[PDB]
What we know:
Oligomer: homotrimer
Family (chain A): Belongs to the IspF family.
Keywords (chain A): Isoprene biosynthesis, Lyase, Metal-binding
Largest sheet of chain A: 5 strands, mixed
Protein name (chain A): 2-C-methyl-D-erythritol 2,4-cyclodiphosphate synthase
Strand content of chain A: 25-35%
Bound molecules: 4-amino-1-beta-D-ribofuranosyl-2(1H)-pyrimidinone, chloride ion, magnesium ion, zinc ion
Enzyme class (chain A): lyase
Catalytic activity (chain A): 4-CDP-2-C-methyl-D-erythritol 2-phosphate = 2-C-methyl-D-erythritol 2,4-cyclic diphosphate + CMP
CATH superfamily of chain A: 2-C-methyl-D-erythritol 2,4-cyclodiphosphate synthase
Amino acid sequence: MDFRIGQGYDVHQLVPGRPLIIGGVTIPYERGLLDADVLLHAITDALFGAAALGDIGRHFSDTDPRFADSRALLRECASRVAQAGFAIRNVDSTIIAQAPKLAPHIDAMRANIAADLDLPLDRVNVKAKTNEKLGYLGRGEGIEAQAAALVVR
Amino acid sequence: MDFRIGQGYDVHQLVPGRPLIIGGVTIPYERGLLGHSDADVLLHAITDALFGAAALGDIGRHFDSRALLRECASRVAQAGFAIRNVDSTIIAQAPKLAPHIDAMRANIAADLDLPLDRVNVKAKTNEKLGYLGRGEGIEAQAAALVVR
Amino acid sequence: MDFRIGQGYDVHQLVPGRPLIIGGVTIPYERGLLGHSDADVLLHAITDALFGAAALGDIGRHFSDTDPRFKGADSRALLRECASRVAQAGFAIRNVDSTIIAQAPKLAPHIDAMRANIAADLDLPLDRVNVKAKTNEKLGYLGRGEGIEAQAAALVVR
Ligand SMILES: Nc1ccn([C@@H]2O[C@H](CO)[C@@H](O)[C@H]2O)c(=O)n1
Ligand SMILES: Nc1ccn([C@@H]2O[C@H](CO)[C@@H](O)[C@H]2O)c(=O)n1
Ligand SMILES: Nc1ccn([C@@H]2O[C@H](CO)[C@@H](O)[C@H]2O)c(=O)n1
Ligand SMILES: [Cl-]
Ligand SMILES: [Mg+2]
Ligand SMILES: [Zn+2]
Ligand SMILES: [Zn+2]
Ligand SMILES: [Zn+2]
């Protein structure tokens, strides 16, 4: 068959004054991302990438009247991928954040993502890493997400 | 069928008195990428991902950047692989890459003898974080699928 | 034809008084990687990619970052257990690719040995495993030699 891979990347600053929302989940924390859902953006990009449809910013413009939260954008991304003729086979991802502890929220993120993509739960994975106190990530000045997606025509 | 994946990463410093060439496109800008070659960060990343998918080592083991990308494709074919698709991301705070991306994709598809629909190029800023966010460098990431 | 992909990321600080172990190879160096285990950044990145492809969470879920039993743990034994759990989930590994980002030391003389280790631990031929290396072009904490990063991608099939 006609398999394709895509990859995705995103990053946002972490400062006091905003909520922390990752993978559709609000996480109690003294800082927040400037909805800024890094995980969902990275996955969205990975999906557009696999389908060879450009990137998230080309589809969902900052100014566009029609566009909403990152979960809504993920659902629209999936519909556009479906229409291009592709079925999603799996998603894997990594969140790099020095803090807070993300492990408790992983299943919720996975359920949110699988729901939005209409995928069996066992085809969505989310992982978490600190940056070992290195760089802006290790200083808690930002949070990064990475994603990989496999699709088939 | 015998599918393989590869991943590629590259970064280059932005310095004065150099042309900015990304995905074969010369972009007007006060700085350009520093490297031994023409320092095309996107093409190097894709090259590494293709060598990676074919398990042929890396770009430094083997070697303008389009010529090298063409040579990469040759050696991937030499090894018995056909390229199925390529995806990538450019991380640049500045300049605006939007008007240049379609050409980048066209360039890459030409060099890899692939139709446009099997090649993708994406772009992000680094939200003003780190060396990328200060406009000190530009990073590229790539994923490639091949089959034997 | 039930293919899945996974991706992995790891980084560790490079400090004095530690062995430098990357891809299971002990590299002569005045510094080594800091972690709870042997801190093998490449193997941890690959382990993460495999667990990820099989949708089994991540390396910390399986091999606790704070469990004393993993103090100085051999990250190859961890990779072998990962592959065993991936097989138990019903997946065969098809290939692995990876990158190490390091200012120093020179990794080229050790790369083939790293590849052989990973191939052995994953029960794969050499031609299905790849290890790439590069500098960070003097940029950032990696350019200052404060740590070493690895990236990995894996393809499996159920
Ligand atoms: N240096 C850059 C960085 C990003 N972009 C484009 O901006 C949108 C938002 O990421 C995306 O659509 C992306 O392609 C750009 O044109 N130049
Ligand atoms: N710390 C490092 C970084 C890079 N390299 C090798 O140099 C070539 C160009 O990056 C590549 O072939 C790469 O393998 C190395 O041996 N050690
Ligand atoms: N910000 C973070 C960083 C890491 N983790 C979890 O810690 C374990 C070791 O990396 C891993 O199991 C990882 O999931 C976390 O829960 N939150
Ligand atoms: Cl460096
Ligand atoms: Mg990075
Ligand atoms: Zn974002
Ligand atoms: Zn380069
Ligand atoms: Zn590690």
